[PDB]
RNA sequence: UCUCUCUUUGCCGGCUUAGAUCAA
RNA sequence: GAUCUUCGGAUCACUUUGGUCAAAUUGAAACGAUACAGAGAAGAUUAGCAUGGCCCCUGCACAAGGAUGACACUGCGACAUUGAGAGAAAAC
């Protein structure tokens, strides 16, 4: 069923250019992991690195 | 198929309302022995008077 | 509205004494006078639905076809009134 | 008094067959003379 | 906002049993004809009342109205103010509805009853 | 063994795999009244779930889809349908007489014979549209004068009307043929009056829009309509 | 739902060895044990 | 029971009410009344 | 209130007490019944 | 065989301490 | 990202969204008041218990109350006509 829903949301948008395997996996991630900002530290509440 | 689990603290969830009773099953035939005579002597024989 | 007033009165006088047919035979009578199908059977079986055994509702609601030229209706009415009652001679003798 | 929950009425209201369950439950666990407060382990409705 | 700002178009179908105007539609179509028509019948013309202030009800009603969505017939009374927009598409005539209510022409808006004509009743079916 | 809901696939989602849930007697049937179970799926992500809205016996007595409220055969409302097509005689609009007929109608309908038959339906829309195409193809000397010059004066066998110059049908018919001669502004009509005014933003498109004449005009309820008794003396 | 509609009497008695069972009254003959009982209370 | 008839209705119908000493006199009329009336229809013979 | 008694006042010390002088039809429909007022007097004696 | 009239013509709320009492 | 592994990779975890329905005139009930009459049993005052059901209300209730809770309590043609006379008509 995720299969499927992946295949129509690809029909849909055009947006099939993958590839699948085990280090591929982290590779993906790591891209999407690049654009997320850091996660601050905890005991730093109010702003200038808050977690 | 998931049967959704009701809450517990529910209370009824809707009205219920009386419907007339529907048309019964059509009537057998009555089969019955050939009707007798009883002559206008007995007719009168059973007429009762006002109270 | 009137009609309304008229069925109003005959459909409650019909549901507080369900037995007395001279209230089907004049809620027939009365329907029957302006809108002359449709409920009228409706009301008549209902009525035979009452009381199934009542030779003058059957004879009334045999006549009242014969009134408004509907035949084949009132020859299959007299075959259930025949297949029901085999022992009364009155509807065989208004079937020949 | 809100519109905000008037989805949670229904259920609300249907606690009330087992209020008395929660009555009792209060009063068999109250504090006893000598501790200052105690702290219950509690189980309630997510409606509140 | 997670619903569309804009106006109604042509060909704007939704499933019968919803309302055009994101709502759901019931069946017994109320007894004031106030909030959402039903599935059960199928209609495009709404009652709108309030001010008769001139003659000119009729082109004020129509200046108000059109700009709303696409019109079939306009039947506005003289002697009261009264008027029978009949709109093309379900979508336009509930959108007019949800728009020309206890606005400045307070209207009385509702849903249209039907038809006593035997010619109206013709040409409508 | 109450299975399954009749819904279209149409608002069943284009996916071939799907996810619902079902809640017995949660709900009372929008035509019978009766208790009946909902079904809620998600028609694509992005959406708010659906959810069936008749019971089972509805749907089978009108051949429709309990979500989005379509036939089945012909994919048009179902109101649309039953006074359109008038196949099989609907029901009342009122509760009590509704219900019971829809309960009785539901024991006869399971009691074996199918209400609906597609044959019939096909025939019936073959004949609609047949019918729709065929629908596609002294005294009045005195009702002439009788107040035609009195309006004139106060606010203004064969007779031969005039053209002048001075400086069925719905209205958005009107409205889409005027365009190429000018902005619109508002167009007030009546069939009954069969006149039809129109006003431009400016009054030089209004008069090259009167220099194209050479069916058309140039420039109670009945007080309206004693010029409109000419159409057939015109 | 009622205060006589509660569960009660749950456990259905049947009839022990000694008390009169199918059996044991189809073993018995009652023609004969009726005839001495009436003679019995004839005798009275 | 306070909130079944709360979100029912009273369900009167179809319910039978006991006797309670108070409606034994005017019950054990109608059953003599439905006794003398099954015996007028027996003993009558028939087209009387 | 769902009954329309919106003039009858439960104090927070759980006593009804009418906010206006009632009629007969008001009297007779704002009556209760035992369990409800059994639950008041429950509910007194807890938050007492 | 019509019309009118008459005649023959078999015909189609309960209970209890009567509920209890009673002078212009 | 953590773990190993040998820089091929392997493990570890894997698809939310309780929806009388979008920020309250126009889809959760049932009416105030004023104006009209204005309290069962054949005089008059008045105890009640019932019967019927698309009438309910209070009640935990198969108690009991709400004016004996209220409304209702009637009425007709599977009559065969001949019994006769009279003027007419068509007929003994
Ligand atoms: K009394
Ligand atoms: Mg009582
Ligand atoms: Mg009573
Ligand atoms: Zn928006
Ligand atoms: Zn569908
Ligand atoms: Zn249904």
Redesign the interface.
Known sequence: YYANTHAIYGKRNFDDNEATTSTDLKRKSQKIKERREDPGDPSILEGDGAY | MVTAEQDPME????????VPRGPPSPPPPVLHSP??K?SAQ??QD?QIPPS | EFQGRKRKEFEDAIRRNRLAMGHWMRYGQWELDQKEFARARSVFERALDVDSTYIPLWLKYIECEMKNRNINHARNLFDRAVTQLPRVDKLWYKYV | SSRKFRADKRSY??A??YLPHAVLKLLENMPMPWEEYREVKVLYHVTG | CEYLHRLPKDTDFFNANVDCFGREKHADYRDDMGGVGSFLRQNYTLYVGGITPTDDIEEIVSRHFAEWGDIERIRVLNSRGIAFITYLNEANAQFAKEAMAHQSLCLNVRWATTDPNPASQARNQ | DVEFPSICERCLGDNSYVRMTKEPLGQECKICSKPCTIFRWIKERGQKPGKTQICVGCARYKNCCQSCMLDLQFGLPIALRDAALKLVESGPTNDINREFFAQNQQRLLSNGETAYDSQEASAAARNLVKKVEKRELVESKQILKEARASDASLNAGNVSLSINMEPELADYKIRKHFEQYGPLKSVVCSHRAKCAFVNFKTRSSAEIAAAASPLKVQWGPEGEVRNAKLADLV | ??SRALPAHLKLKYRQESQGTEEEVRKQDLREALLRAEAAHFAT | ????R????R?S?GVAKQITKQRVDSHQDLELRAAVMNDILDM????? | H??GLTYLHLDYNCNLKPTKTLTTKERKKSRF?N??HLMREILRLTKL
């Open positions: 209370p009824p969830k809707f009205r219920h309302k009386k009707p007798r009883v007995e007719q059973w | 209201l249907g009330l067959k | 739902t009622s | 029971n306070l909130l079944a709360q979100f029912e209705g369900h119908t009558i013979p028939e087209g009387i | 769902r009954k019944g369990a409800f």
